[PDB]
């Protein structure tokens, strides 16, 4: 059976079809150009001249192209030359040549799409088609930051067009988690206590905590965590950072080696803090090697407690930024009175 096939992979070449993919992650889409049914073909010149194209109809509202990382290899491992790639923002913008090929093949891409085109049909034919050598196209596409603000699902589909005939690939679907960091104000540490004093008043010179709750990274995700930070530029005219902070697991976490770390476990040992005393700021950073030791199948979430002393009267606000794999996500803003 002639079948162009499409599979999504992470940067380590693991298959990630149906996995949760974080904003900022790359989909290393691998497109198969299925030519193995044409072995020994001996078509006319007119027929060969109808050309060979491949189409990827990618979801442009969710993903951005990484053009430069596009690679085409033949089944014998030779890199493929003679195939050029063009990205079109809409059908309306494609040349007539392209609109006609697509129309006569019964292919109508939704929104934006890529075309891979054999520059010389005769030569492409003689090289890969009459010999039935399948090609592999890798066309990496990054999930836009915005998908991480809204959550959502996206799908990708390809077509191959041989002698002007179109064949559709399977459709690959993934989804993106809405990362929503939260910020509470608490009077005690101890994660079990759900008390939140956002809005209330704090007596002058009270030692308290800002509770910085990280975004939830769901199980079955597509790549390794390498960064998970809590950045807090607090108002030092109101709040004095006391130099004390702790970090806790907020869901059960499973490592690559099978070791489990229960929700509530203190994770401070796997962190450092970058402190900027003049600016009045602190960044709590998970060590990259710890994050990377976590299984891609595991859920992951953590929360930091920074200990503050209220040192003046007035109304003071605070906000923090949770940075996950290079993408920033802001929390709500708390406000207390003194
Ligand atoms: Ca599209
Ligand atoms: Ca500050």
Short mmCIF file of C-alpha atoms in Angstrom, two decimals, residues 72 160 178 224 275 319:
data_model
loop_
_atom_site.label_atom_id
_atom_site.label_comp_id
_atom_site.label_asym_id
_atom_site.label_seq_id
_atom_site.Cartn_x
_atom_site.Cartn_y
_atom_site.Cartn_z
CA UNK A 72 16.00 15.43 3.57
CA UNK A 160 2.80 13.36 -1.37
CA UNK A 178 -1.73 25.70 30.01
CA UNK A 224 13.14 16.69 29.18
CA UNK A 275 19.94 36.87 44.83
CA UNK A 319 4.20 38.94 41.44
#
